[PDB]
């Protein structure tokens, strides 16, 4: 039972870490799009 519960808590930690890496990917994507907005605004200024 200790071995089973140890694997269960390992899976719990692995799950939370997968979600943290997911949020890091999301932060990278949000920065991509957030900088693309600035680039498109500078592009609109060049067009003006």
């Amino acid at each position: 039972l200790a071995a089973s519960a140890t694997k269960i808590t390992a899976d719990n930690i692995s799950q939370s870490e997968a979600w943290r890496r997911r949020r890091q990917e999301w932060e990278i994507q949000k920065n991509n799009a957030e900088s693309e907005i600035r680039q498109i605004d500078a592009q609109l200024e060049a067009l003006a």
């Binding site: 140890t6 808590t9 719990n12 930690i13 799950q15 939370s16 979600w19």
Partner: protein, 49 residues
């Protein structure tokens, strides 16, 4: 500069299993107290020896 409050040499099995159970991301007061009650049960047992 090098002391890590989580990983320590000679860390007891009790502290190991508590760090195990605090190693998730959602540390609300409920899990944070359940972990401590369980640590305290193990501590009580090793202190009664």
């Amino acid at each position: 500069n090098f002391v890590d409050p989580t990983l320590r040499t000679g860390q007891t099995g009790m502290m190991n299993t508590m760090l195990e159970q605090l190693s998730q991301s959602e540390l609300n007061k409920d899990t944070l107290e359940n972990g401590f009650r369980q640590y305290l049960t193990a501590f009580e047992q090793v202190a009664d020896l």
